Write a protein that binds this ligand. Structure first.
Ligand SMILES: *Cc1cc2c(cc1C)nc1c(=O)[nH]c(=O)nc-1n2C[C@H](O)[C@H](O)[C@H](O)COP(=O)(O)OP(=O)(O)OC[C@H]1O[C@@H](n2cnc3c(N)ncnc32)[C@H](O)[C@@H]1O
Ligand SMILES: *Cc1cc2c(cc1C)nc1c(=O)[nH]c(=O)nc-1n2C[C@H](O)[C@H](O)[C@H](O)COP(=O)(O)OP(=O)(O)OC[C@H]1O[C@@H](n2cnc3c(N)ncnc32)[C@H](O)[C@@H]1O
Lengths: 547, 535
């Protein structure tokens, strides 16, 4: 924090002044800046990196917008009481109660969920109308827990950028292009290489600006007449914060590497409530790309291959490999208190030539990659016994990160047994152990497969008894974190007495999500974020101009 | 401007605050202890006051060495299993965790010796208490490290009451002032940003300001009983815990506008609890450190075993929060302990959180029926009572048949002594906390005996809870609370569960909360004594 006396605030103390100062150039920052600019305010976006877009650039930009205009025009109602029941059941399973006045949620979580329902659609419509985020409907994207009877609009809520690829995998690049192009068009200023590091307060404790560290190690002070709106992302890539706050000891994530939790430090001397700090948006990752800091990494949202299993270091299956990524990641952190170890800490995806040829993908974090792609993480052997030798060497390379994990002495025998058992399940279509393929979301993210006339369940096919074979290490990671200072439903960052710190706002992964540890559907990070960017810019516009 | 002034102002009257106050007073300082409750002792009063003191005087005199390199390998291996490396310069720990562990080894014994010498905490050795992971080859002093108050009962279950008696009696004798009904709510700073005192809310809702000339030392306990903080920070959604109910995380609020580093906020000292005593806020509740009964199993709502019921409490609690992402539920959220008349008569205990309790004890949580089919009807009624806390979980339609199968299977393992599913009884800690059992000449494994085919039967709901939390502002090894640049704020100190533990999610041994705490109370008081008098 920097505090200015009245004299200082009214002097030549600032190198620049705007009505609204936005911090970060991902979805939260760009949309907050656009909505602010369209209310007639002067706006600057300050970005720590040399490039715009943050994690959002990397995303597929599915965005889950309840009650949106396309789904209604398509005749698909999204009744508010039933929307609230779906999200309450998924978010707070222990406390969900359809007879309780807030469904078993706290008043804050209920109010935040209502705010997503009320505001995501008008936000989406305005961004599209102005040309900053034109969209198309994604009617076939079903919610991640659509089988729950509380979900009364099981598909229809997803939008994505109009010019996203067919697979949607580059939707984030298209969104950052449209949003940033519109923002520049619209007279929003951008300052890159500006790492915000303090909020400046006046004598009344109101936010009146920021201090940023520039790349020459000089500092600048920039005045906000109305509001400072943080959209600075999460803290996946500050390992100390990640380790000390999250509920699982993840290895990294697909978040931009500049997402280091600066707002946690900035607000440490402002009296905020840090909330939801124990949760991230979770996903499995290609382990070596996380340790190797491959900035192109995606989370493993689609675990590719039908003639493919995951095994643990014993050579046994432990999980439905097609389970929703936010839930599958948690299996990797099961704790064995007797052995003082995480038995699933790394799992090994193993596949055959059929899945290599017909399930490879450049998209959605697949470990199986097509010719010409980066395959440094793919282990290869002509035989299963050779493959285990190579898996062992790979585990040894990372010993100091994974408890000096070793394959069981019985790995080879156990893997052969596991494959024979899996192949029987693949032949009947019924995975009696882990129910792979029996929920619709398992199929949604199944990936590509070779068409087989006899195939009973599209998520499984027997692994060939002839090589070659392929493997990759899978570890647990994030998309990014989703905890931070608590806001009200208009994005105002609160003090410990639940009262706004005047002039201070936050949107997106830098503030607390109301979704706890849950991931409701594809697009469940960005759709709510656009709702709160809209509500925050609307409230920020109403602030008095201050000194 | 201040209504009272002391050299050292201590906040909280459990182990951390009383020992910090005593060590401060014995350096010649004037000292006050401010306590929020209208009684002294906090969670410490409820404890068994085992305290794990590496390299202590009794174990050495008994010929038991505790070599420092091997102590550090044991705690590093247990605390940070992914990163533990015997060839790494700090064993794979961060420099801070390594230095804090070294500080425990260096200072716990002199702290224990001085408290005993002055008469504030006389002790006896507990040589047979083995470390919780003594089978690990890194542990080269597998037993000997535990002390307990001299006059604790044979079972040690009232050691906390004895310790609070000896410590508080000594403190009053020694001229330490006490102010109860004083809820500290702010640190007062001078213009240089140094702590110079506190503000406390008194019971008449008036506020008083008290000056500290040298230091303010927080020993205010954890945040188990602020449900919002508990829910938003811990790695598991626990229902409560045996912490004193005044442990509401006030230091988290107090330091929110001081620029601290909150660390280890994701971890608590964990234990199963008798679930109804947690929901019912029975202040006498203990964590279930000893899961009583040999003719006893835990089953889930399907009527099947899912865990070794004798596993170390800090690890067993975690099984209750296994997540089933396909059904969007916690399958083990409540487990049901079921036992027969033999364990009722021969494994009951008033101590260590046992669900099986002797005649005369509070048995409100004990579900009863003369048959197993009647018992499941009663278990269902009990789960229905708490539906809004446990996801409306219900017993399986097949519960009765499944329970009969589970019992026949368990009884075969009890007959051979070999629990082929969950290895009950195969680690020494399973025996350490096994509890009492009826002597049986032919018993192969002391943790199991076949459950009778004739009633009556008994059950209790088991849920997950804490002892207390162990996250908060980061200190250095001298107890000084740090700013975000790792520099001491300062005059400001903290000790015990109100600041970050260096033990992550681990529970090294019985006494692994209090022994380290006494080390840091000593180090903090020694550093606080060296502060200049200010403001
Ligand atoms: C990794 C990933 C995530 C993802 C996804 C695919 C991948 C590969 N697909 C998604 C999808 O289709 N739908 C969805 O709902 N979520 C999806 N995700 C998650 C999503 O990408 C993120 O949740 C979202 O993009 C986060 O947006 P937000 O605006 O909160 O954050 P950001 O895009 O990371 O941008 C933050 C920016 O702030 C800058 N920053 C950081 N610190 C500072 C300071 N001190 N000063 C100035 N700027 C700062 C960062 O550099 C970054 O640019
Ligand atoms: C529940 C329990 C825990 C326990 C145990 C048995 C039971 C039933 N047995 C143990 C054992 O044998 N060995 C061991 O190592 N640990 C054991 N535990 C855990 C142990 O009890 C605790 O970790 C330890 O006692 C905590 O000590 P600490 O001094 O940190 O905390 P406290 O005893 O809870 O005292 C805190 C006091 O601070 C007061 N307070 C709180 N807020 C304020 C404010 N704002 N102002 C003033 N005072 C405040 C509390 O009221 C309390 O008295």
């Amino acid at each position: 924090v920097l505090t200015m006396t009245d004299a200082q605030a009214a002097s030549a103390s600032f190198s620049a002044e705007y009505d609204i100062v936005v911090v970060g150039s991902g979805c939260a920052g760009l949309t907050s800046a656009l909505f602010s600019r369209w209310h007639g305010n002067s706006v600057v976006v300050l970005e720590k990196a040399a490039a715009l877009g943050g994690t959002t650039f990397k995303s597929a930009f599915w965005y889950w917008v309840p009650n949106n205009v396309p789904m209604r025009a398509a005749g698909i109602a999204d009744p508010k009481p039933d929307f609230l029941k779906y999200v309450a059941r998924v978010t707070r399973p222990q406390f969900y109660d359809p007879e309780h006045p807030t469904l078993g949620l706290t008043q804050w979580e209920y109010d935040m969920c209502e705010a997503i329902y009320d505001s995501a659609s008008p936000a989406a419509e305005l961004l599209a109308q102005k040309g900053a985020l034109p969209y198309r409907h994604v009617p076939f994207a079903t919610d991640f827990f659509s089988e729950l009877p509380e979900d009364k609009a099981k598909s229809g809520r997803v939008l994505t950028p109009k010019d996203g690829s067919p697979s949607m995998a580059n939707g984030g690049q298209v969104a950052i292009r449209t949003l940033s192009t519109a923002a520049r068009r619209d007279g929003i200023a951008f300052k890159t290489g500006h790492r915000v590091q303090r909020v400046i307060l006046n004598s009344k404790g109101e936010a009146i600006g920021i201090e940023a560290l520039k790349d020459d190690n000089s500092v600048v002070r920039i005045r906000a007449r109305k509001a400072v709106i943080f959209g600075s992302g999460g803290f996946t890539h500050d390992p100390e914060l990640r380790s000390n706050f999250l509920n699982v000891p993840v290895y990294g994530g697909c978040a931009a590497f500049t997402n280091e939790g600066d707002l946690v430090r900035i607000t440490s001397s402002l009296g905020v409530q840090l909330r939801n700090m124990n949760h991230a948006w979770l996903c499995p990752v290609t382990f070596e790309k996380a340790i190797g800091r491959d900035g192109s990494m995606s989370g493993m949202f689609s675990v590719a291959g039908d003639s493919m299993i995951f095994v643990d270091k014993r050579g046994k299956r432990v999980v439905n490999e097609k389970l929703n990524y936010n839930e599958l990641c948690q299996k990797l952190f099961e704790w064995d208190g007797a052995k003082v170890e995480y038995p699933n800490l790394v799992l090994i995806s193993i596949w055959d030539q059929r899945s290599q040829d017909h399930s490879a993908s450049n998209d959605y974090g697949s470990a199986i990659v097509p010719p010409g792609a980066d395959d440094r993480h793919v282990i290869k052997s002509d035989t299963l016994d050779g493959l285990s030798q190579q898996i062992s060497l790979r585990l040894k390379k990372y010993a100091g990160q994974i408890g000096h994990m070793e394959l069981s002495s019985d790995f080879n025998a156990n893997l052969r047994e596991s494959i024979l058992r899996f192949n029987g399940f693949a032949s009947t279509g019924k995975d009696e152990d882990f129910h792979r393929g029996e929920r619709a979301s398992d199929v949604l993210f199944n990936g590509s497969t070779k068409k087989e006339p006899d195939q009973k369940n599209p998520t499984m096919w027997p692994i060939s008894s002839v090589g070659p074979y392929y493997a990759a290490l899978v570890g647990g990671g994030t998309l990014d974190t989703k905890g931070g200072p608590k806001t009200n439903t208009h994005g105002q960052i609160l003090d410990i007495h639940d009262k706004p710190i005047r002039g201070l706002y936050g949107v997106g992964n830098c503030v607390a999500s109301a979704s706890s540890g849950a991931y409701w559907a594809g697009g469940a990070t960005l759709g709510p974020m656009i709702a709160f960017a809209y509500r925050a810019a609307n409230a920020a516009h109403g602030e008095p101009k201050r000194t």
